[PDB]
Design the sequence.
């Protein structure tokens, strides 16, 4: 599914991501924009042979099982395919674990490089929330 911007903001809010670990909703929308362009079916293969999945490009080295990332963990206790669903529940639940791991949203390098310190509330401006 390709979400609309405000559409995704609403879904994220309903699943409690808004202000989670102190990160306002616009941080999460901005991260999703630059990770996946709001496409739940996004995938990216990394150099190391792990893969990133879904709207927040969550990786198989730690977070999900894809059967093809030697040595990896599955801390969210999900198949990585669950992160590609039109329903963002599994991506949100897993993002809550990631952002709680110690580095906050810096876990998403694209958030650090493209959202951190910017006017992230612009990503939810206009939205009926
Ligand atoms: C200010 N900018 C980068 C946020 C983008 N919005 C308008 C969707
Ligand atoms: Cl915000
Ligand atoms: Cl594996
Ligand atoms: Cl933090
Ligand atoms: Na894994």
Sequence:
């Amino acid at each position: 599914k390709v979400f609309g911007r405000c559409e995704l903001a609403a879904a994220m809010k309903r699943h409690g991501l808004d202000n989670y670990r102190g990160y306002s909703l616009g941080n999460w929308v901005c991260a999703a924009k630059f990770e996946s362009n709001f496409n739940t079916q996004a995938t990216n293969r990394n150099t190391d042979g792990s893969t990133d999945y879904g709207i927040l490009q969550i990786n198989s080295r730690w977070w999900c099982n894809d059967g093809r990332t030697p040595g990896s963990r599955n801390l969210c206790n999900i198949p990585c395919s669950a992160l590609l669903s039109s329903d963002i529940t599994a991506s949100v639940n897993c993002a809550k674990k990631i952002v709680s791991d110690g580095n906050g949203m810096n876990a998403w390098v694209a958030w650090r490089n493209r959202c951190k310190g910017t006017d992230v509330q612009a990503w939810i401006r206009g939205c009926r929330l």
Observations:
- Strands lie at 43-45, 51-53, 58-59.
- The radius of gyration is 14 Å.
